[PDB]
Design a protein around this ligand. Structure first.
Ligand code: BCL
Ligand code: BCL
Ligand code: BCL
Ligand code: BCL
Ligand SMILES: CC[C@H]1c2cc3[nH]c4c(c3C)C(=O)[C@H](C(=O)OC)c4c3nc(cc4[nH]c(cc(n2)[C@@H]1C)c(C(C)=O)c4C)[C@@H](C)[C@@H]3CCC(=O)OC/C=C(\C)CCC[C@H](C)CCC[C@H](C)CCCC(C)C
Ligand SMILES: CC[C@H]1c2cc3[nH]c4c(c3C)C(=O)[C@H](C(=O)OC)c4c3nc(cc4[nH]c(cc(n2)[C@@H]1C)c(C(C)=O)c4C)[C@@H](C)[C@@H]3CCC(=O)OC/C=C(\C)CCC[C@H](C)CCC[C@H](C)CCCC(C)C
Ligand SMILES: CC(C)=CCC/C(C)=C/CC/C(C)=C\CC/C(C)=C\CC/C(C)=C/CC/C(C)=C/CC/C(C)=C/CC/C(C)=C/CC1=C(C)C(=O)c2ccccc2C1=O
Ligand SMILES: COC1=C(OC)C(=O)C(C/C=C(\C)CC/C=C(\C)CC/C=C(\C)CC/C=C(\C)CC/C=C(\C)CC/C=C(\C)CC/C=C(\C)CCC=C(C)C)=C(C)C1=O
Ligand SMILES: COC(C)(C)C/C=C/C(C)=C/C=C/C(C)=C/C=C/C(C)=C/C=C\C=C(C)\C=C\C=C(C)\C=C\C=C(C)\C=C\CC(C)(C)OC
Ligand code: HEM
Ligand code: HEM
Ligand SMILES: [Fe+3]
Ligand SMILES: [Sr+2]
Ligand SMILES: [Sr+2]
Ligand SMILES: [Sr+2]
Ligand SMILES: [Sr+2]
Ligand SMILES: [Sr+2]
Lengths: 258, 318, 317, 40, 280, 60, 60, 40
């Protein structure tokens, strides 16, 4: 008998092996996925006083340690993070309801204005010099031939009003580029950072538009504990404020449209 | 309105960077840098220096040899008419040894240039492999690239060398030509009864589509959190910021679950390596194990049936 | 530019071939369909001949084919063969002047053979030629030499040190694709194997080479182009080899392939010794037949015009 | 909506009469369409 | 439930439409007015694919009816119906499921939009999503329209749609020669390459050899500069990858848009414009 | 069938500009939709030609 | 069917540069659109051979 | 929309007359087209 066709061929079983390796892969990737934000926030946890820490399937992976270079530290993941109050109040007492920011929305530090507490230290070059520093601290840097020098352009907010003028340019000493625009504010001549991401140029006019906030809001830009360098804490703090204006800076960004 | 972080609108220069320093043994670096205002319009304007060791030189060497055999051969097929060479270039190619020869080393005029170009190409790709492992060690880094390059090398090897040796015939490897190698692809599917019904080729297709899906999603994300320096992924990985937060949350609020600044790079990594690895497996079973995938799909009841509205009588059966 | 480039406008003419959703469909340019129709106009017939008279073989001297015809009918048959094959030249093209019965000029030894070629065709190949049948015009079109006749070609030049790629060139004969550029000699002259698909899912009992697959692909490109259609005209590409999923045109094409093997092998190669160099390719092989020769890019030569049924002198016995 | 109670009388008026003008043009077009070619 | 840092951002407002009406969360998903339209479109779409599976091409008791996942398939109406609505049990169903799919993808896109407005992030993602939505639309709306009939759309079935691709592909004889196809394929392959390179990199620096600390930007640039004499840099690599994948989708959309409506011949034949230039 | 009209108040709750363009857009789209529906059906006016179909003014 | 003498106010609500360029875009698009609509039907005005066929009868 | 009440009667005027001119050229074209080959 030389014809007993087997119903099982290498192609079936290779498709079997694959799916098994697959499932293990998926599972694993979802585990690396819980090295942050976990366990979750329910009132399942609060109701039970915490006896239901929310982690789901799969579960959380044993911590991993990152050894920052330069006497920098050591970070772990997953970690235990201290809760932080919410600077807002429930739009409804029902769960899943959004919260309204407390007080003046741009000040709230809630919503598009919220942000975490990153180190109060500076990111560093390879050598260990403050990575992000101004061109005034980073002597070498230079505009690229054929690019308007931002230095001296007028910074202008979302409504038209002048905001200030570019007093300097902050650069990456690691990957040479403009990261932050410095702004001598008109209303008080204080110096603030302006993330490049929020800034549009109008080279033919030497203006630097900013849809984010109004010219006035530039007065409240979060500040630097040193005008010649900036910490991780301070960057988030700077940007999130402008970001808040995307939903706050006007009595209309709140939406609807209809 | 808002900058999109598509085009660096105002650049800055600084003296070029020779790079983090390599240990003893890792040879000097060569070439001295330049800047392209235009690469600069979209990315690091610095061009080079480059590193070249024994490895790097033996790989550039083999690789260019292989490129010459293929090319010179193509000029020969048009009679040394560089004009005609220019005219039909897309259609020119260097075909493989004929089956009549099996796996024997063939005469120059009958395929031997292909076996030599295939030989030298492979040695040069695998030398570039070693190159990236060396360049990756000099930096204390890990071999994640090398595990991927090794996967793509896997597919390559399956295509032009492994399947051929298993099938006992150099004529089964792919020929060097644009249109010729496209034709090789189509004929390959045809010869084995439509490759669409090959499970592995379906998975490789889900994974190719997935590399486009993930990189488009992630990439769009990092730009959307570029405002918070999300591109600076390393520190968002060590010291989570509102970029990594807004990032993980956009997706969380959208599709119900999410990843992290470190893990998305693993989903993406694993999805790419998977393409080539299902892909190679896919070519491995063709002829070695399965000869007609459509039939295979029928035997496993996967091929759909449609009302037979058009049909033709079989002359072979008259 | 880097020009741009090659383009038709929407909407194309379309025809549904297979079941809805299966994708077996056809697209075409309406304009060019109309131009092909004007170029594929048929010559109207000559009035029937009454006759009523003796048989050709009784009133003529060298009638070895059109024997059983009445005189009138023979004469008519001569006028059709005249306008159909060589009207700029007239009667004298195939005859020695003053001597209608003589075979002292080759175009007649050939003409005679082609009388047996059309007859065999109209009477023996209906599973292929149906009731449309063929006639001289089909290939000649007012031309002495079918415009679309072929020859085994040698491809482009090679130094002496290396042998030809056998495939890999820009050729209109394989649809512009790079497959092998002469899929005709081994399939439309000789009878090499076209089948490459296995009939078993698992392997170990199908020796078809990939190369053979490419030759079949080339040839198919040829066929497709000659009849002016795509594979869903005859196939269901999920299974090129599956006859039940194919269209009745695959059956027809199958018998046609064998037919061209008979025209080329027993009617054309033999005329090679009495034909001039002007009618021969670089290997001494003579201009022969292909599907294009007759179809000239249309699924039925001259859009399925019925010319032959009007000339009874074109059928066997 | 930063309108006065009176600028919602005005806007409403122009809105309604304008809209009625549109509906008017419509009855015109539909009338032509029916005379030359009734569709029911 | 929320991430351990989520409550602080779960602000009110940002809609386009609905306002406080549907301005709430469910588990981790954001609802919004478009989540509701979306869920409705989606649910009816799927529930109808279930009914199509239930009935089969010849009725629930015939042998072509099936619930096997590889083979369930819902196909368009014949071409004879043109752009008209065709009877339900003759491809009508397929038309409605399509309307639902287009509406669901568009709702999904608009809901990602409200989510950008809430979180205050750029809208790069839903814009990028819209490229896939576009490709889907050419494959069901644009092409079949330009082609005077909705039946030119692909059927919704796992392998049967693969068959659609196959025979449509083969009407042009050697599809590989479609030049836009050549582009799109180039991007799909390169995209898959950069992704493997970025992926590999991030993971190679944040986790280096034991005995080494998280690596640096300087390392990053130095490695790929070491290997290939160039490094596009961190920001931009995220930019490129977005370019490649969106373009890959683009050229797929155009390569299929021209296959019919603007080109009917085989595709290799297109390349004739090149062999006939007056240079050779 | 109650008593309060005064339905002008509608613009104190609904933004007029956006409503304006919304109706505008919807009208052009509904327009195209309807045009494609009738032109694809029997009440067709294009694929006819009055008083004679024009490409059948010459057969040749 | 008359003109509400305060219809100018429509320009206190709708931005003039946008309404204008919008009309130009929509109109040019419609134009290109219709032109190929008609060229794609029986009413063709290009492929007619008026007053005499322009190539020849073939290649000759 | 950054206009004065004085400059929108002005704008409305120009808009209306121009629009009507356009509509005029359109009516001419549709009239010549109807003559040369009536479509209904
Ligand atoms: C069997 C079908 C008949 C026919 C039956 C109808 C019917 C019935 C109707 C149309 C209508 C329309 N048809 Mg028709 N139509 C035919 C064939 C055609 C053809 C063609 C190439 O064959 C074309 C181009 C059109 C095009 C048109 C549009 C002009 C018009 C409005 C549609 C729209 O989008 O509203 C756009 C919406 C707008 C608000 C713009 C309004 C523009 C009009 C022209 C007036 C301008 C007012 C202007 C906007 C003033 C604004 C205020 C200022 C800002 C101060 N029809 C066929 C033969 N057509 C509709 C119509 O005209 O309404 C009277 C209508 O009711
Ligand atoms: C022709 C019709 C057949 C077809 C036949 C095949 C065949 C045959 C194959 C694929 C392959 C694949 N097909 Mg397919 N394919 C079909 C239709 C499709 C469709 C579609 C929408 O219809 C899609 C999405 C795909 C998708 C794909 C990809 C998913 C996959 C390969 C990924 C890749 O890049 O590997 C390419 C990457 C590499 C090869 C590695 C590259 C690295 C090398 C070493 C680089 C060296 C660079 C060099 C040294 C630089 C110097 C240059 C020198 C000059 C050479 N196919 C149909 C059914 N397809 C693979 C497969 O499935 O096999 C099972 C394959 O081989
Ligand atoms: C059949 C033989 C021909 C051929 C015929 C065709 C034809 C015909 C086509 C392609 C198409 C393409 N081919 Mg091919 N192709 C050939 C061989 C190949 C090869 C190869 C190695 O040989 C490759 C790599 C490819 C690859 C490609 C890409 C260039 C392209 C598909 C990407 C795309 O459509 O994006 C588009 C992506 C989408 C449309 C997805 C959109 C997502 C939507 C909005 C949401 C989906 C939501 C859904 C509900 C998700 C499920 C989630 C559930 C909720 C859980 N082909 C062979 C030679 N190929 C297709 C194309 O061009 O694309 C239009 C096409 O029409
Ligand atoms: C798995 C299926 C088949 C096949 C499937 C397809 C399909 C399908 C397609 C291609 C196409 C191409 N293939 Mg392939 N291809 C095969 C395996 C290979 C191999 C190999 C040694 O293994 C090579 C070198 C290539 C190379 C090429 C690229 C030249 C090109 C698309 C670019 C891309 O993705 O780049 C990513 C990588 C880079 C950017 C790195 C650097 C590139 C190097 C230097 C390219 C070398 C060759 C070059 C063409 C010669 C001179 C330049 C010319 C002017 C263009 N293929 C496999 C075996 N390939 C696409 C095309 O259209 O072109 C034919 C296409 O449609
Ligand atoms: C996840 C699978 C994906 C993948 C991954 C992948 N590819 C890779 C890698 C990885 C991980 C590498 O590590 C390696 C790389 O270097 O990445 C940038 C590589 C690679 N991907 C490339 C190609 C490639 N990969 C492809 C596909 C894929 N690879 C998949 C999409 C494709 C396809 C199918 O489209 C291609 C074309 C190469 C650039 C590189 C391997 C390079 C190599 O092996 O080099 C061999 C030899 C040469 C290049 C010869 C040198 C010729 C020089 C360019 C000329 C310089 C001359 C100089 C002037 C000197 C003077 C000369 C003297 C002799 C006179
Ligand atoms: C355009 C470039 C690439 C891309 C980008 C892209 N896709 C995206 C996004 C982006 C940026 C999103 O943000 C969005 C997303 O949510 O991320 C996953 C999305 C998305 N990518 C997905 C699909 C997808 N994208 C693909 C590809 C691509 N998308 C390109 C590779 C592909 C393919 C074919 O390769 C698929 C299958 C979805 C998971 C998701 C959007 C999900 C969604 O819109 O959900 C709402 C709708 C439903 C839940 C279903 C509606 C119910 C239907 C009525 C029934 C289904 C009908 C369907 C037409 C039948 C087809 C059957 C098939 C078996 C043939
Ligand atoms: C009767 C009635 C009411 C019905 C009942 C309703 C029912 C049936 C209830 C069931 C409810 C349940 C079970 C589910 C609901 C189902 C829903 C609505 C559908 C899911 C739709 C959805 C989009 C699923 C797609 C799944 C997949 C695999 C998508 C592909 C995307 C991808 C590969 C996923 C993983 C990777 C992800 C998520 C990356 C996102 C991501 C990226 C890309 C970053 O770059 C980044 C950077 C820095 C930090 C974080 C991130 C990050 O999270
Ligand atoms: C930390 O991050 C990282 C870095 O930073 C340090 C790196 O440097 C690196 C190293 C990376 C590199 C050195 C990058 C190398 C890049 C590679 C290999 C990609 C190869 C791409 C090419 C050769 C270019 C091909 C394309 C062209 C030549 C231009 C083509 C132009 C065309 C087709 C016409 C333009 C029009 C279109 C495409 C149509 C419309 C386009 C769209 C709709 C797309 C939209 C896009 C956007 C961006 C919004 C990595 C991996 C990294 O992860
Ligand atoms: C005029 O031109 C001058 C500059 C001279 C040179 C020009 C050169 C040019 C332009 C060359 C152009 C070349 C092109 C475009 C080539 C394209 C190639 C393509 C697209 C190839 C696609 C696929 C090819 C594959 C997958 C080949 C695989 C082959 C393999 C894997 C061979 C392996 C062989 C080995 C390892 C040999 C082993 C030998 C042993 C040791 C076993 O022998 C005993
Ligand atoms: C109007 C022009 C023509 C006339 C009047 C004509 C007349 C004749 C006559 C009277 C005969 C019988 C001679 C005999 O065998 O005694 C004959 C035979 C023959 N003629 Fe013609 N002829 C004409 C054109 C042609 C043409 C154009 C061809 C070829 C294209 C042709 C091919 C033949 C052949 C092959 C025979 C021998 C027939 C057989 O064996 O059956 N003739 N012709
Ligand atoms: C360009 C795409 C086409 C491809 C790839 C193609 C491919 C093939 C293949 C692979 C076979 C062999 C199946 C086997 O291995 O058993 C085949 C057979 C055949 N095809 Fe084609 N085909 C194409 C177009 C056409 C067209 C247009 C026709 C008819 C006009 C046609 C008529 C036939 C016939 C009759 C056979 C059977 C021949 C025999 O068995 O001797 N094909 N085709
Ligand atoms: Fe990234
Ligand atoms: Sr066609
Ligand atoms: Sr049943
Ligand atoms: Sr020429
Ligand atoms: Sr006409
Ligand atoms: Sr002309």
């Amino acid at each position: 008998s030389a014809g007993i066709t087997h119903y099982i061929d290498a192609a079936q079983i290779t498709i079997w092996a694959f799916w098994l390796f697959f499932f293990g892969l998926i599972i694993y990737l979802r585990r690396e996925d819980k090295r942050e934000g976990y366990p979750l926030d329910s009132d399942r946890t609060e109701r039970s006083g915490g006896r239901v820490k929310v982690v789901g399937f799969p579960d959380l992976p044993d911590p991993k340690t990152f050894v920052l270079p330069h006497n920098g530290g050591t970070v772990v993941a997953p970690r235990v993070e201290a809760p932080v109050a919410v600077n807002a109040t429930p739009f409804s007492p029902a769960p899943g309801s959004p919260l309204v920011p407390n007080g003046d929305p741009m000040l709230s530090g809630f919503g598009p204005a919220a942000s975490p507490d990153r180190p109060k230290h500076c990111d560093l070059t390879f050598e260990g010099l403050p990575k992000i520093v101004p061109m005034r601290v980073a002597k070498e840097f230079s505009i690229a031939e054929g690019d308007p020098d931002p230095r001296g352009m007028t910074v202008v907010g979302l409504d038209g009003e002048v905001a200030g003028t570019v007093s300097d340019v902050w650069v990456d000493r690691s990957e040479p580029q403009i990261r932050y625009l410095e702004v001598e504010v008109a209303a008080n001549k204080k110096k603030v950072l302006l993330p490049i991401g929020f800034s549009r140029f109008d080279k033919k006019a030497r203006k630097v538009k900013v849809d984010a906030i109004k010219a006035a809001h530039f007065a409240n830009v979060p500040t630097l504990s040193n005008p010649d360098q900036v910490t991780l804490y301070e960057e988030d703090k700077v940007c999130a404020y402008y970001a808040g204006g995307k939903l706050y800076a006007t009595a209309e960004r709140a939406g609807p449209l209809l | 309105p808002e900058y999109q972080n598509i085009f660096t609108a105002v650049q800055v220069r600084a003296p070029a960077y020779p790079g983090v320093p390599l240990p003893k043994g890792n040879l000097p670096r060569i070439g001295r840098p330049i800047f392209s205002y235009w690469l600069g319009k979209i990315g690091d304007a610095q061009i080079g220096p480059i590193y070249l060791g024994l490895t790097g030189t033996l790989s550039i060497f083999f690789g260019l040899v292989a490129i010459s055999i293929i090319g010179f051969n193509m000029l020969a097929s048009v009679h040394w008419d560089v004009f005609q060479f220019l005219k039909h270039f897309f259609w020119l190619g260097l075909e493989p040894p004929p089956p009549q020869y099996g796996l024997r080393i063939p005469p120059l005029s009958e395929g031997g240039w292909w076996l030599m170009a295939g030989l030298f190409l492979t040695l040069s790709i695998l030398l570039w492999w070693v190159r990236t492992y060396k360049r990756a060690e000099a930096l204390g880094m890990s071999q994640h690239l090398s595990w991927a390059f090794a996967a793509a090398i896997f597919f390559y090897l399956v295509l032009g060398f492994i399947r051929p040796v298993m099938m006992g015939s150099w004529a089964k490897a792919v020929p060097f030509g644009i249109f010729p190698h496209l034709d090789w692809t189509a004929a390959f599917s045809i010869r084995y009864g439509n490759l669409y019904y090959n499970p592995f080729h379906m998975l490789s297709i889900a994974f190719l589509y997935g590399s486009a899906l993930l990189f488009a999603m992630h990439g769009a994300t990092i730009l959307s959190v570029s405002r918070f320096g999300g591109d600076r992924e390393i520190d968002q990985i060590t010291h989570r910021g509102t970029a990594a937060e807004r990032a993980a949350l956009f997706w969380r609020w959208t599709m119900g679950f999410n990843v992290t600044m470190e893990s998305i790079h693993r989903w993406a990594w694993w999805c790419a390596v998977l393409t080539v690895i299902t892909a190679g497996i896919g070519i491995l079973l063709s002829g070695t194990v399965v000869d007609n995938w459509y039939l295979w799909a029928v035997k496993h009841g996967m091929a759909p049936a449609y009302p037979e509205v058009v049909t033709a009588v079989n002359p072979y059966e008259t | 530019s880097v020009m741009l480039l090659g383009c038709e406008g929407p909407p194309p003419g379309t025809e549904q071939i297979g079941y809805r959703g299966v994708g077996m469909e056809n697209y075409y340019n309406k304009r060019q369909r109309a131009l092909s129709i004007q170029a594929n106009q048929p010559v109207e017939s000559l009035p029937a001949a009454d006759s009523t008279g003796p048989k050709a073989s009784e009133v003529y001297q060298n009638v070895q084919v059109l024997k059983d015809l009445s005189v009138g009918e023979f004469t008519r048959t001569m006028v059709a063969v005249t306008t159909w094959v060589s009207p700029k030249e007239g009667c004298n093209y195939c005859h020695v002047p003053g001597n209608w019965a003589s075979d002292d000029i080759y175009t007649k030894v050939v003409s005679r053979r082609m009388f047996e070629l059309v007859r065999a065709a109209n009477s023996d190949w209906k599973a292929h030629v149906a009731e449309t049948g063929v006639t001289c015009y089909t290939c000649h079109r007012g031309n002495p030499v079918p415009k679309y006749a072929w020859v085994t070609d040698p491809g482009p030049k090679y130094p002496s040190g290396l042998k030809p790629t056998g495939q890999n060139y820009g050729s209109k004969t394989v649809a512009y694709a790079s497959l092998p550029f002469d899929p005709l000699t081994p399939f439309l002259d000789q009878a090499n194997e076209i089948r490459i698909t296995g009939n078993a899912a698992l392997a170990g009992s199908n020796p078809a080479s990939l190369k053979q697959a490419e030759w079949t692909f080339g040839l198919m490109m040829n066929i497709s182009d000659s009849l002016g259609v795509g594979c869903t005209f005859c196939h269901n590409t999920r299974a090129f080899n599956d006859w039940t999923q194919s269209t009745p045109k695959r059956t027809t094409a199958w018998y046609a392939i064998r037919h061209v093997r008979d025209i080329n092998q027993n009617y054309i190669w033999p005329l090679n010794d009495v034909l001039p160099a002007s009618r021969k390719g670089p290997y001494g092989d003579p201009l022969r037949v292909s599907c294009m020769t007759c179809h000239q890019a249309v699924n039925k030569p001259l859009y399925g015009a019925q010319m032959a049924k009007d000339y009874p002198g074109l059928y066997k016995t | 909506t930063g309108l006065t109670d009176d600028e919602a009388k005005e806007f409403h008026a122009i809105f309604m009469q304008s809209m009625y003008a549109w509906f008017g043009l419509v009855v015109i077009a539909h009338l032509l369409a029916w005379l030359y070619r009734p569709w029911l | 439930a929320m991430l351990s840092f989520e409550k602080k951002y779960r602000v009110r407002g940002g809609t386009l439409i609905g306002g406080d009406l549907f301005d709430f969360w469910v588990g981790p998903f954001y609802v919004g007015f478009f989540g509701v339209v979306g869920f409705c479109f989606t649910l009816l779409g799927v529930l109808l694919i279930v009914w199509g599976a239930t009935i089969g091409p010849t009725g629930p008791t015939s042998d072509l009816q099936t619930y096997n996942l590889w083979r369930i398939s819902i196909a368009p109406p014949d071409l004879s119906y043109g752009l008209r609505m065709a009877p339900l049990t003759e491809g009508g169903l397929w038309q409605i499921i399509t309307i639902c799919a287009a509406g669901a993808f568009i709702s999904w896109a608009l809901r990602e939009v409200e989510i950008c407005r809430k979180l205050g992030i750029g809208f790069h993602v839903p814009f990028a999503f819209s490229f896939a939505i576009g490709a889907y639309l050419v494959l069901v709306f644009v092409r079949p329209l330009l082609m005077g009939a909705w039946g030119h759309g692909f059927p919704y079935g796992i392998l049967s749609h693969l068959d659609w691709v196959s025979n449509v592909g083969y009407q042009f004889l050697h599809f590989h020669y479609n030049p836009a196809h050549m582009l799109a394929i180039s991007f799909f392959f390169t995209n898959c390459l950069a992704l493997s390179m970025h992926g590999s990199l991030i993971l190679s620096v944040t986790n280096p050899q034991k005995g080494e600390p998280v690596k640096t930007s300087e390392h990053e640039n130095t490695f790929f500069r070491d290997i290939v004499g160039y490094s596009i840099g961190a920001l931009a690599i995220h930019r490129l990858g977005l370019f490649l994948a969106l373009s890959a989708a683009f050229w797929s959309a155009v390569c299929i848009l021209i296959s019919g409506p603007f080109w009917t011949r085989g595709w290799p034949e297109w390349w004739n414009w090149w062999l006939e230039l007056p240079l050779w | 069938f109650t008593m309060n009209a005064n339905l002008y108040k509608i613009w104190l709750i609904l933004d007029p500009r956006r409503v304006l363009v919304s109706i505008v857009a919807f009208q052009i789209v509904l327009g195209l939709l309807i045009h494609m529906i009738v032109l694809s059906t029997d009440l067709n006016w294009l694929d006819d030609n009055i008083p004679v179909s024009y490409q059948a003014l010459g057969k040749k």
